[PDB]
Amino acid sequence: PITKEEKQKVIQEFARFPGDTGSTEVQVALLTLRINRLSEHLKVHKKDHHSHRGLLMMVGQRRRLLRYLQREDPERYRALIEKLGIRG
């Protein structure tokens, strides 16, 4: 899986304050990991459709958030989209 370790690190590196394990800001970064991870997997497992679905859902979930985050606060969106590095 993902290292329960570096998972924390992801949460850590992206969060407004200690604890905070569910900010929009986090969830994004937090999914994005699991995405890119899956992404890279499918890249070799092309024939693994089932899982692909999940990725589509995952990309979806984060699509929503990133929207809500843009919709609510444009400032910190322009940060997260870029720190994370997406929207291409």
Partner RNA sequence: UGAAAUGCGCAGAUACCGGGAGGAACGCCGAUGGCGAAGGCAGCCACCUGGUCCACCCGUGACGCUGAGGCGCGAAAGCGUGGGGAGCAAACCGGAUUAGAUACCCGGGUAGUCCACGCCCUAAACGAUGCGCGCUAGGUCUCUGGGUCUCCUGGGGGCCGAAGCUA
Partner RNA sequence: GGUUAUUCAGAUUAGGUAGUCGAAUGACCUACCU
Partner RNA sequence: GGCGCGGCUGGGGGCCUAACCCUCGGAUGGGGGGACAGCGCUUGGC
Residue from the set 10, 23, 32, 77 that interacts with RNA by CB under 7 A: 23
Does 85 contact RNA by CB under 7 A?
Answer: no
Phi, psi angles (nearest 5°) of residue 56: -60, -40
Structure tokens at 12: 């850590």
Does 13 contact RNA by CB under 7 A?
Answer: no
Question: Smallest distance from the beta carbon of 2 to Mg ion, in angstroms?
Answer: 8
CA distances from 35 to 6, 16, 31, 46, 85 (A): 15, 22, 6, 15, 13
Does 28 contact RNA by CB under 7 A?
Answer: no
Residue from the set 9, 53, 78, 87 that interacts with RNA by CB under 7 A: 53
